[PDB]
Amino acid sequence: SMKIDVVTIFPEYLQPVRQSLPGKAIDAGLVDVAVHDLRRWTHDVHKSVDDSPYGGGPGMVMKPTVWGDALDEICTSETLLVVPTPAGYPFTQETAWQWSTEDHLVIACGRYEGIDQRVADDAATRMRVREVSIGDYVLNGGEAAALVIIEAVLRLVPGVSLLEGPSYTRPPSWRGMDVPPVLLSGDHAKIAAWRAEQSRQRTIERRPDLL
């Protein structure tokens, strides 16, 4: 059973996740994903979520007073607070496996230049906090990263190396290209060895970093 809370200034962006949830998983109480508009915790009539950076520079920084109030209300001592950021530790399949057993994830979606660092540092004095990157590219905000994280974790919750090689299905011949005959051979030891070699060759060509 897992609760996921997402905090964002674009709550509609998280409409897809709540759709893709099977009804049976929700009714068996195995999962609950809730999305919260950050501006609910703003203090001023202009609903400000950001301000200029100390020390100057580009972009605005999200306000600690607003985030602090939000996390105070949503988090508990048992919460795993997830903060997507290009500056984070790498989020990998290992990470997804580990988090799939958590009772409560809270994902803080940041925008612009980032979130005042005191938010995470304060939170870390009473809960577990993980700043993570889903990849070495830059996005405008953490919302797309939240979708990726939610999907990678929840598909490892029951009910909710080398690269893989090519897959084939019917028909045996299509636009002049035949399925590799070994796959139709009924020699399953040989098929396994062909697939292993396919995997080795693909990994050398595409991901030599994994060797």
Ligand X SMILES: COc1cc(COC(=O)c2cn[nH]c2)cc(-c2cccnc2)c1
**By CB under 8 A, what part of segment 186-205 binds a second copy?**
188, 191, 195, 202
Instruction: Decide: is 26 part of the binding site for a second copy (CB under 8 A).
Output: no
Pick from 150, 149, 104: nearest CA to 3: 104
Which contacts (CB < 8 Å, 24+ apart) does range 42-49 have? 42/66, 49/9, 49/111
Question: 88: annotated binding-site residue?
Answer: no
Instruction: Decide: is 65 part of the binding site for a second copy (CB under 8 A).
Output: yes
Q: Which is nearer to a second copy, 26 or 191 (CB)?
A: 191
CB of 170 to ligand X, least distance (A): 17
Number of residues this chain uses to bind a second copy (CB under 8 A): 80
Which partner in ligand X, a second copy, none is near 84 (CB below 5 to 8 A by kind)? ligand X
Pick from 173, 177, 15, 152: nearest CA to 90: 152
Instruction: Decide: is 60 part of the binding site for ligand X (CB under 6 A).
Output: no
Instruction: Decide: is 49 part of the binding site for ligand X (CB under 6 A).
Output: no
Among 151, 159, 197, 201, binds a second copy (CB under 8 A): 151
Q: Which residues contact 177 (CB under 8 A, 6 or more apart)?
A: none
Stretch of 28-36, 39-47, 101-109, 148-156 contacting a second copy, by CB under 8 A: 148-156
Helix, strand and coil content of the chain, in percent to the nearest 5, comes to 40, 25, 40
The token pair that represents 89 in the structure block: 């530790």
**Which stretches within the chain are classed as H helix?**
15-20, 23-27, 64-74, 93-99, 117-123, 143-154, 188-206
Instruction: Decide: is 77 part of the binding site for a second copy (CB under 8 A).
Output: no
Known binding residues for S-adenosyl-L-homocysteine:
84, 110, 133-135, 137, 139
